[PDB]
Amino acid sequence: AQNPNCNIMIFHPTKEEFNDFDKYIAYMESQGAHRAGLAKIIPPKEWKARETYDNISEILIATPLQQVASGRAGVFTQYHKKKKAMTVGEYRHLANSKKYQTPPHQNFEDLERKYWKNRIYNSPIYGADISGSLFDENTKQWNLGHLGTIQDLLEKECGVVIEGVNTPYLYFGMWKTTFAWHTEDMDLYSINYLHLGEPKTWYVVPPEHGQRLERLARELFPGSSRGCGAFLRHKVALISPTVLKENGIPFNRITQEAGEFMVTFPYGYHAGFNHGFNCAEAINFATPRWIDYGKMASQCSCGEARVTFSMDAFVRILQPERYDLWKRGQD
Numbered sequence: 001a002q003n004p005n006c007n008i009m010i011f012h013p014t015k016e017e018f019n020d021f022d023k024y025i026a027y028m029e030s031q032g033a034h035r036a037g038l039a040k041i042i043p044p045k046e047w048k049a050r051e052t053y054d055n056i057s058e059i060l061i062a063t064p065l066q067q068v069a070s071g072r073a074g075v076f077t078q079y080h081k082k083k084k085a086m087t088v089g090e091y092r093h094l095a096n097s098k099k100y101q102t103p104p105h106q107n108f109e110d111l112e113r114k115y116w117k118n119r120i121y122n123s124p125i126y127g128a129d130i131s132g133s134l135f136d137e138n139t140k141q142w143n144l145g146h147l148g149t150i151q152d153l154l155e156k157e158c159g160v161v162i163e164g165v166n167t168p169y170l171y172f173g174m175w176k177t178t179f180a181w182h183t184e185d186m187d188l189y190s191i192n193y194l195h196l197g198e199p200k201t202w203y204v205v206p207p208e209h210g211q212r213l214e215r216l217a218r219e220l221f222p223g224s225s226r227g228c229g230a231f232l233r234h235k236v237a238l239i240s241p242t243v244l245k246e247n248g249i250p251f252n253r254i255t256q257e258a259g260e261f262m263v264t265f266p267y268g269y270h271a272g273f274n275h276g277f278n279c280a281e282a283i284n285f286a287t288p289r290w291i292d293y294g295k296m297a298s299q300c301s302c303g304e305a306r307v308t309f310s311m312d313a314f315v316r317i318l319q320p321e322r323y324d325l326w327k328r329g330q331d
């Protein structure tokens with residue numbers, strides 16, 4: 001069995017190997033990359049996502065989210081307080097302000113220390129889930145706006161024809177902005193490209209051990225657990241690496257830098273934070289191996305998780321028993 005310790009793998013495809021997305025994902029899985037839950041892909045040196053970022057300040061962040069934490073330094077929840085719209089120009093200025101800027105630090109490890117020590121005492125502002133793309137339409141390889149759609153994958157594999165579309169989202173981050181422990185909707189893959197700015201640190205639990213994380217989360221957030229049988233779908237809970245080590249939960253960590261892709265694999269729980277002002281683009285995708293994960297994915301039916309139009313059809317076709325109850329939550 002390849003990669004039995006479920007380490008995060010890093011790949012360096014040639015320009016030739018960068019032509020066929022699906023084939024390279026299948027290659028990475030042949031080498032066991034999926035066992036980690038997360039892989040890094042460093043694009044060939046000849047590739048570029050777009051010519052410059054010189055004009056990005058005019059993007060609107062219609063609903064910036066202030067991420068307010070509650071709990072203790074290693075075990076907390078975050079709630080998203082909606083703020084007034086601001087441009088990326090305005091946001092970048094805010095990220096760089098004394099109140100919000102990255103502190104002096106020695107290296108990534110010192111900054112990670114400072115994050116886990118001090119995150120709860122600040123409320124950074126995140127521009128998340130902004131429909132759009134920063135890839136140039138002339139970028140033919142690994143252009144997150146030109147992937148084959150999940151609906152097309154389901155049609156090709158299963159013959160069914162469903163409504164829905166699949167488009168990318170932009171994330172504008174600052175120091176301490178945080179993504180809580182989650183898997184993707186319907187335990188899909190994700191791919192994330194860091195277009196610009198400061199790094200993003202990731203933590204991941206191997207898919208084969210995801211239930212160990214869920215059991216810990218139920219113990220650590222016991223009222224949330226009683227409210228909903230899939231409350232990690234709410235995307236609000238944080239658990240530090242120190243806490244995970246204390247409870248014997250297998251995980252790995254890696255820092256993504258500007259110009260690099262990360263892939264998360266089905267049912268790979270992940271969480272992380274941004275080091276400073278940055279812009280990422282991400283999208284969900286499917287392969288044939290996903291289908292079985294889609295059929296088994298947990299669902300939030302308490303009504304908190306509230307998700308896209310396109311998820312309806314996935315639940316309807318892959319989880320018909322759950323469909324009625326899940327849609328009562330969605331309505």
Ligand SMILES: O=C(O)CNC(=O)C(=O)O
Pocket residue numbers: 171178179190191192264270280282283
């Ligand atoms: O970049 C972020 O804030 C969060 N991204 C993801 O969870 C992902 O790409 O799957």
Ligand SMILES: [Mg+2]
Pocket residue numbers: 055056057058059
């Ligand atoms: Mg602009």
Ligand code: NI
Pocket residue numbers: 182183184190264270
């Ligand atoms: Ni994700």
Ligand SMILES: [Zn+2]
Pocket residue numbers: 227228229230231233234300301302303304305
């Ligand atoms: Zn719920």
